[PDB]
Design a protein around this ligand. Structure first.
Ligand SMILES: O=C(O)CC[C@H](NC(=O)N[C@@H](CCCCn1cc(COCCOCCOCCOCCOCCOCCOCCOCCNc2ccc([N+](=O)O)cc2[N+](=O)O)nn1)C(=O)O)C(=O)O
Ligand SMILES: O=C(O)CC[C@H](NC(=O)N[C@@H](CCCCn1cc(COCCOCCOCCOCCOCCOCCOCCOCCNc2ccc([N+](=O)O)cc2[N+](=O)O)nn1)C(=O)O)C(=O)O
Ligand SMILES: *[C@@H]1O[C@H](CO)[C@@H](O[C@@H]2O[C@H](CO)[C@@H](O[C@@H]3O[C@H](CO)[C@@H](O)[C@H](O[C@H]4O[C@H](CO)[C@@H](O)[C@H](O)[C@@H]4O)[C@@H]3O)[C@H](O)[C@H]2NC(C)=O)[C@H](O)[C@H]1NC(C)=O
Ligand SMILES: *[C@@H]1O[C@H](CO)[C@@H](O[C@@H]2O[C@H](CO)[C@@H](O[C@@H]3O[C@H](CO)[C@@H](O)[C@H](O[C@H]4O[C@H](CO)[C@@H](O)[C@H](O)[C@@H]4O)[C@@H]3O)[C@H](O)[C@H]2NC(C)=O)[C@H](O)[C@H]1NC(C)=O
Ligand SMILES: *[C@@H]1O[C@H](CO)[C@@H](O[C@@H]2O[C@H](CO)[C@@H](O)[C@H](O)[C@H]2NC(C)=O)[C@H](O)[C@H]1NC(C)=O
Ligand SMILES: *[C@@H]1O[C@H](CO)[C@@H](O[C@@H]2O[C@H](CO)[C@@H](O)[C@H](O)[C@H]2NC(C)=O)[C@H](O)[C@H]1NC(C)=O
Ligand SMILES: *[C@@H]1O[C@H](CO)[C@@H](O[C@@H]2O[C@H](CO)[C@@H](O)[C@H](O)[C@H]2NC(C)=O)[C@H](O)[C@H]1NC(C)=O
Ligand SMILES: *[C@@H]1O[C@H](CO)[C@@H](O[C@@H]2O[C@H](CO)[C@@H](O)[C@H](O)[C@H]2NC(C)=O)[C@H](O)[C@H]1NC(C)=O
Ligand SMILES: *[C@@H]1O[C@H](CO)[C@@H](O[C@@H]2O[C@H](CO)[C@@H](O)[C@H](O)[C@H]2NC(C)=O)[C@H](O)[C@H]1NC(C)=O
Ligand SMILES: *[C@@H]1O[C@H](CO)[C@@H](O[C@@H]2O[C@H](CO)[C@@H](O)[C@H](O)[C@H]2NC(C)=O)[C@H](O)[C@H]1NC(C)=O
Ligand SMILES: *[C@@H]1O[C@H](CO)[C@@H](O)[C@H](O)[C@H]1NC(C)=O
Ligand SMILES: *[C@@H]1O[C@H](CO)[C@@H](O)[C@H](O)[C@H]1NC(C)=O
Ligand SMILES: *[C@@H]1O[C@H](CO)[C@@H](O)[C@H](O)[C@H]1NC(C)=O
Ligand SMILES: *[C@@H]1O[C@H](CO)[C@@H](O)[C@H](O)[C@H]1NC(C)=O
Ligand SMILES: *[C@@H]1O[C@H](CO)[C@@H](O)[C@H](O)[C@H]1NC(C)=O
Ligand SMILES: *[C@@H]1O[C@H](CO)[C@@H](O)[C@H](O)[C@H]1NC(C)=O
Ligand SMILES: [Ca+2]
Ligand SMILES: [Ca+2]
Ligand SMILES: [Cl-]
Ligand SMILES: [Cl-]
Ligand SMILES: [Zn+2]
Ligand SMILES: [Zn+2]
Ligand SMILES: [Zn+2]
Ligand SMILES: [Zn+2]
Lengths: 694, 694
């Protein structure tokens, strides 16, 4: 029998291991020949595995690379202009890789060129609240200073935006052991911690969903008209470069000026964490100088797109997508995910060869240039937006399958909560101590829901990965799942070796998942979700779960506003319309659910399946959010302060943020009221899509 | 048997006559009690007729009315400030209506208040090319002058925009007998011509699709947040008022300054048509003074929405809509259309009572506030946009059924051309001399296609009526049809009594259609189109006809560009991508048509019906056209110079318009190239929606 169990049983830990090894022997940086060859390999293999068609979709997009013969570095310079200390030109390569070529040295992708020289100011994590503290409380001015910020807490592009707005003339990012070195674990190669020479690569754009900087709204195809660089979207205006903690300690140790305001500003290095500006007296005439010579260049990228045509509803698409490009070897990011996709395709193809097809079409994607701003997924979705918005059922992401070995992590639309609970109750837990128990049982025990007893935590989607175009631009129900660390006992951010040369096959095989049991579990979750979405007669979405969360988010945004009771009185700021809409949505969803359970008629079914499919679509506002036209979902957007985090009722949230500091309160509260009206209207309009249709 | 013939045979000329009489005895100005009572009457009657549900949908929108106790007028004033001549305070009412109350006096809706005094400049029709001629060739400066313009040729709101941009401080609009008095016909009540005391009402907004000025993008419901007046969309900045030709002659007769540049500037009055500025010597110290005291006021409006639920596809909507509000009695505009809608509803309801239902849902709409900027239709479509864009099959407009008695006029999307040809071959011609012949035969003989022998003319949709939101904003296939005059032998614009108090039941019954045979024919065309769209198994759209016109429009826009061969060389301006896309669309549409004709499988059918329904949708660009975010269709928009006219490839057309006058040619030709890329991309993306889906 060809059912979910058949699909799941065909998945093998040993195959995922073999694929991971295969994908991580050489670097696969976007835009390079090595990553085009891997695209061709995956295309060939997916054909072999049994997909109906497998094509490459290419685009020519703006990418950024260091200059191989003019390396980036930072100096401390003396009064004479002698560079008395220089940061490293590369990370010491790991054992057995010291002869691998084409390892890109650490750099911040899309940095402009420059050689700014100046006094340092230390800005903690460079968050909005860190700059508030510096400017408003400490009265420190960053204008014309080079800022040094520790990585962690928020997306690095928000740090750079924050520093630019503070007037910085350059930014130095570094990895503090406080945030990237777990106590009691050894540095790579002897454990999974970041060594002092390790450095985190990553782009520093602020694209807000636009995709390729030069072609917002349209695919970067063969005839595309491109903006000039000066009009490009999202590029930083000041040079930026990342360093490791051995080099950071040399830059921080001499810092003078003001003491850190409190302990939350102190990392773990043996330095005072003085804010500056500049160095202590004896070194007061020394300065820091950056030398950045990277160049931005339009470069071809390649997505692999595989199709498994549906037997009954070929014009409904369930998409499983993850990226293939990596900063270096991509041992965790992305190849731990790409190897799981590859095994999922193999398992679906095995059923296909035996005569099976899914009810709906499944599309499988190997995206390129994710690391440079979600470029491959976004350009493809721009090209195919009409097809996706009328036919797209769901998008399941597949980046890193592991960032720890403790329990499951799922982020998704509320429409998928019930599907995830049900699927995980049918899967076996891979956890020690949970032998013979369900994944739901282990997950719920280790990661309990904050709101509900006996249920596991499922988070909102943020951004910083390839589901962004599908969810926040196009309104297609989306989700992601991976294995993660224990958030209670672990204070570090992400995993320590993120975007470093040390993210290798050996890191995974030795330290994260030697048996590949957590990878297999993630393959079952991602693959199972795709299976259900593509095969279920009635789409496995529960609109009632959206109703529950909408009330939670309404309560939350009301609570923020109610910190300003005088202003709500003065400007007659009422949330009554939003609560009304949420009440209506709850009532209508309940009635729709009754009809759905209680309706042979394939028209009523598909009519009902379309109401389910277009429900996420109904939260899209075609005018977008203020100054962010590609974030169009009214319930969820990436936080304006941290792209990785999701924010609920973002238009109202950003209207309320720091409102007590606005110079014209009447105008500011007017915009809060406008955003309440937009959100209440959008929730009522989404509810009405679930009413009887005539 | 319940088939189209049964529906058509039930339609009766005598019923349309009775309804027209019923709808035109008192004025039904938007926002007034009389028009709310008529809404309630129509709601009651549509229920009686058999519709499943009939509701009122209300909104509170910005409307504009004269001040009843401070009337608008224009004076000639002397040096002492004595007003020596005043324009009329009202049109002489027609026979038997001299005691009717609540006739709104002539005014320009949405004019600001003011009493500007100054010298006149005569600006012909106030078209873009008239202002070019004044400023560029004649070197006449309108800054600080009051301009007087004749009505005709273009929408009055474009005249006022053009005058404001020229620096005018007020605008006087008048009806010249050249444009509103057909030679050899008597003035009302003795014929259908405009008397010298007649005046054309009408709004002078420039909304570009926005709907209510205060709530662009969102319905003007009970909790809507409204812009302040200063931020409202589309309002004029200078006072404007319309007059008849008796009063115009008094204002024009004294004009001095420059002679008219040529005969195309001369109307039919016994005046020189001097351009000015100002009056001839003896009267040089006299000036013209406007007194405008109208007020803009948020006011409730009511749409009636009737539903006839589909038997098989209740979640597919075919909409027949027309407005109900009128300037005065609305004898032609709109009640000649509303009486036809009413009879269509009655005929559908007769079939319904006998047990029939259409395959798809039919929605019937009586829109309000059309006269004030398409407000009722637009606010309703804003409220229901998610339902309409996922379920809307087609929109058939139903404003004035007649503007002459010569032949048929149809404007619609290419997707409807074949349906219209086929339907009109099955209908009887009402024309004298064509007894026993088809409507197709009479229409084709009287109004031959410019492109094709043996085929009738069908025009593009422009704007200035309630299909605008459905077609140019939302991308729903739309059409309209009415009886019209002989365009060859008739030089006047529209019909002469348009928007005057003289547009009465008697005008229609005595002069246009005494037997109501042309109304009946229009009812058969509109009703038949609705019938087919709602009942046909395969939707009656032919994508191949879009391919033919796309090539025509590509050839046209290429020809405009090729007036600038040097610049196309210098800036490498190529149309190759657009022709490629159009070639691809032609190929793909041909293959789709083969599958459609040659495909029992209701999924393949509905899959194919969705490809047909979403094909008009595919021409929508969610980013809109430059500075006109609510005009989103890439193939068709209202002309930027005349809202009534449609323009093809509008984004490229406006990029090319007057390009030789732009100060930075590199930038201007860059934007032409950007618009070529957007159009080529959009045509290819629409083509791809017709490809096999997987
Ligand atoms: O160009 C681009 O856009 C990106 C390209 C590239 N993409 C990329 O590398 N993506 C990686 C990014 C890895 C990022 C590592 N990272 C994260 C951060 C910090 O950013 C914060 C993440 O958001 C979490 C904020 O939540 C804290 C408040 O909790 C309230 C509920 O959360 C609402 C905020 O929005 C949620 C959406 O995403 C958050 C997912 O995190 C799940 C939270 N789960 C747990 C929470 C608590 C917990 N516990 O025990 O108390 C346990 C949890 N748990 O999952 O077990 N710094 N570094 C990836 O997606 O795998 C790049 O980033 O350079
Ligand atoms: O707020 C609002 O938006 C509007 C509210 C209100 N709405 C309203 O009152 N609507 C009325 C408006 C009546 C307007 C009367 N009017 C029209 C005008 C002039 O505007 C020009 C109309 O566009 C025609 C331009 O075509 C000339 C170039 O010919 C090339 C092909 O046409 C492409 C231009 O776009 C076509 C879209 O609409 C045009 C429909 O006209 C059909 C042309 N048909 C014929 C053409 C030639 C011919 N012939 O024998 O040579 C015969 C034709 N024929 O139909 O038999 N001035 N006054 C209604 O829709 O019934 C208002 O206007 O105040
Ligand atoms: C949640 O769903 C409910 C339906 O169950 C829906 O209720 C609707 O609420 C609106 C108010 O926003 C009601 O609107 C009223 O309509 C009547 C005519 O039916 C009007 O006469 C009312 O206007 C008068 O009163 C106003 C308030 O004092 C005045 O401002 C105004 O000047 C008039 O005097 C008013 O427009 C509507 O009738 C109901 N519909 C129902 C019950 O079916 C509610 O709006 C939904 N929530 C959201 C956010 O959409
Ligand atoms: C109309 O439909 C046709 C398909 O029948 C579609 O043709 C496509 O045209 C594009 C060009 O826009 C082709 O793109 C090429 O793809 C190959 C790989 O397949 C690339 O190697 C090519 O790039 C090289 O050559 C370029 C031109 O000299 C250089 O600029 C570039 O640097 C490279 O050297 C190029 O990208 C594409 O292969 C076909 N697809 C087919 C035939 O299936 C056409 O685009 C459609 N029209 C529109 C407007 O979409
Ligand atoms: C990754 O696996 C692929 C697939 O097995 C290997 O590519 C094959 O290599 C052999 C030997 O060179 C060729 O004969 C095949 O044509 C290749 N198949 C393809 C590309 O589909 C590849 O060598 C492996 N890479 C590594 C680093 O182990
Ligand atoms: C840091 O690197 C810089 C640049 O390579 C070194 O400065 C150079 O030193 C060489 C040899 O002494 C000179 O010929 C160059 O002119 C110098 N260039 C610049 C820009 O100063 C510097 O010596 C290095 N410092 C340390 C401590 O290694
Ligand atoms: C998750 O599983 C639950 C329990 O099986 C499903 O809920 C049941 O659905 C069936 C079929 O409609 C109903 O007859 C039962 O009454 C439901 N039980 C409940 C709600 O406790 C639920 O539909 C599944 N969710 C999915 C598939 O998304
Ligand atoms: C237009 O026709 C309607 C419908 O016949 C007339 O309204 C009816 O009037 C009678 C007599 O006053 C009432 O008893 C009915 O209740 C009305 N029906 C409705 C409103 O649905 C109306 O009088 C006619 N108007 C004119 C000007 O002839
Ligand atoms: C045009 O109308 C104006 C305004 O009503 C007339 O001027 C008024 O005349 C009365 C009576 O003579 C005076 O008391 C008012 O003060 C005048 N008002 C203004 C604004 O001038 C004027 O007489 C009329 N002209 C003609 C030719 O009828
Ligand atoms: C208009 O009528 C024509 C002629 O009947 C229809 O075209 C025919 O369609 C049938 C059914 O698919 C085909 O078998 C014939 O070959 C077609 N004849 C042609 C193209 O000459 C056409 O489909 C009708 N258009 C509509 C209904 O939109
Ligand atoms: C890189 O640096 C070299 C050596 O100084 C220089 O010649 C070249 O222009 C640079 N390359 C790029 C792509 O800018
Ligand atoms: C910060 O420093 C610069 C002077 O170099 C000045 O332009 C800016 O306004 C200062 N801001 C303050 C003191 O808030
Ligand atoms: C794997 O799990 C063990 C047991 O809790 C833990 O000590 C170790 O830190 C984990 N490895 C990683 C990379 O988290
Ligand atoms: C209309 O004019 C009268 C009389 O001069 C004035 O009192 C009133 O304010 C005006 N009405 C409006 C609505 O402006
Ligand atoms: C038209 O007149 C005004 C002077 O009142 C002036 O400001 C404007 O620039 C003039 N334009 C010309 C002469 O082109
Ligand atoms: C009706 O048709 C006759 C015959 O051509 C014509 O003379 C008359 O002008 C028409 N009436 C109108 C209003 O066009
Ligand atoms: Ca793009
Ligand atoms: Ca509105
Ligand atoms: Cl992921
Ligand atoms: Cl019409
Ligand atoms: Zn990744
Ligand atoms: Zn990454
Ligand atoms: Zn009308
Ligand atoms: Zn009108």
């Amino acid at each position: 029998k060809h059912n979910m169990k058949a699909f799941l049983d065909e998945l093998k830990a040993e195959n995922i291991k073999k694929f991971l090894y295969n994908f991580t022997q050489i670097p696969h940086l976007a835009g390079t020949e090595q990553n085009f060859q891997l695209a061709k390999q995956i295309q060939s293999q997916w054909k072999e595995f049994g997909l109906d068609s497998v094509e490459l979709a290419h685009y020519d997009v703006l990418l950024s690379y260091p200059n191989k013969t003019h390396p980036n570095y930072i100096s401390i310079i003396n009064e004479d202009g002698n560079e008395i200390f220089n940061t490293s030109l590369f990370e010491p390569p790991p054992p057995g890789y010291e002869n691998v070529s084409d390892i890109v040295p650490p750099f911040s992708a899309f940095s402009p060129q420059g050689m700014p020289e100046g006094d340092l100011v230390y800005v903690n994590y460079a968050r909005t609240e860190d700059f508030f503290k510096l400017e408003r409380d400490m009265k420190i001015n960053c204008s014309g200073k080079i800022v040094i910020a520790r990585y962690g807490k928020v997306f690095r592009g928000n740090k750079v935006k924050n520093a630019q707005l503070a007037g910085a003339k350059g930014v130095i990012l570094y990895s503090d052991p406080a945030d990237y070195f777990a106590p009691g674990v050894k540095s790579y190669p002897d454990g999974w911690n970041l060594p002092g020479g390790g450095v985190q690569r990553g782009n520093i754009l602020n694209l807000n969903g636009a995709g390729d900087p030069l072609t917002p709204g349209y695919p970067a195809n063969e005839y595309a008209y491109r903006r000039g660089i000066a009009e490009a979207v999202g590029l930083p205006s000041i040079p930026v470069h990342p360093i490791g903690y051995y080099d950071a300690q040399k830059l921080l140790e001499k810092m003078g000026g003001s003491a850190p305001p409190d302990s939350s500003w102190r990392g773990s290095l043996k330095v005072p964490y003085n804010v500056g500006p500049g160095f202590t007296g004896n070194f007061s005439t020394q300065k820091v100088k950056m030398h950045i010579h990277s160049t931005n260049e339009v470069t071809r990228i390649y997505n692999v797109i595989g199709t498994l045509r549906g037997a009954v509803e070929p014009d409904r698409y369930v998409i499983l997508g993850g990226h293939r490009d990596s900063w270096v070897f991509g041992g965790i990011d992305p190849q731990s995910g790409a190897a799981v996709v590859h095994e999922i395709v193999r398992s679906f193809g095995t059923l296909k060869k035996e005569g099976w097809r899914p009810r709906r079409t499944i599309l499988f994607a190997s995206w390129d240039a994710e690391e440079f701003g979600l470029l491959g997924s976004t350009e493809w979705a721009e090209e195919n937006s009409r097809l996706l918005q009328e036919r797209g059922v769901a998008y399941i992401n597949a980046d890193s399958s592991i960032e720890g070995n403790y329990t499951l992590r799922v982020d998704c639309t509320p429409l998928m909560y019930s599907l995830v609970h049900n699927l995980t109750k049918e899967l076996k837990s891979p956890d020690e101590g949970f032998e013979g128990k369900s994944l739901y049982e282990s997950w719920t025990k280790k990661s309990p829901s904050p709101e509900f007893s006996g249920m596991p935590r499922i988070s909102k989607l943020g951004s910083g990965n390839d589901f962004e175009v599908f969810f926040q631009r196009l309104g297609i129900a989306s989700g992601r799942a991976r294995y993660t660390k224990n958030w209670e006992t672990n204070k570090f951010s992400g995993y320590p070796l993120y975007h470093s040369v040390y993210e290798t096959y050996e890191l995974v095989e030795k330290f994260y998942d030697p048996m590949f049991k957590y990878h297999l579990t993630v393959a079952q979750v991602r693959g199972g979700m795709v299976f259900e979405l593509a095969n279920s007669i009635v789409q496995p979405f529960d609109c009632r779960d959206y109703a529950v969360v909408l009330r939670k988010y309404a309560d939350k945004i009301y609570s923020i506003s109610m910190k300003h009771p005088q202003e709500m009185k003065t400007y007659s700021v009422s949330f009554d319309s939003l609560f009304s809409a949420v009440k209506n949505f709850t009532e209508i969803a309940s009635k729709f659910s009754e009809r759905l359970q209680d309706f042979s008629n394939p028209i009523v079914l598909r009519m009902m399946n379309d109401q389910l499919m277009f429900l996420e679509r109904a939260f899209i506002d075609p005018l977008g959010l203020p100054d962010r036209p590609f974030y169009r979902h009214v319930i969820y957007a990436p936080s304006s302060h941290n792209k990785y985090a999701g924010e609920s009722f973002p238009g109202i949230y950003d209207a309320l943020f720091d409102i007590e500091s606005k110079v014209d309160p009447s105008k500011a509260w007017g915009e809060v009221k406008r955003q309440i009206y937009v959100a209440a209207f959008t929730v009522q309009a989404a509810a009405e899509t679930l009413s009887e249709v005539a």
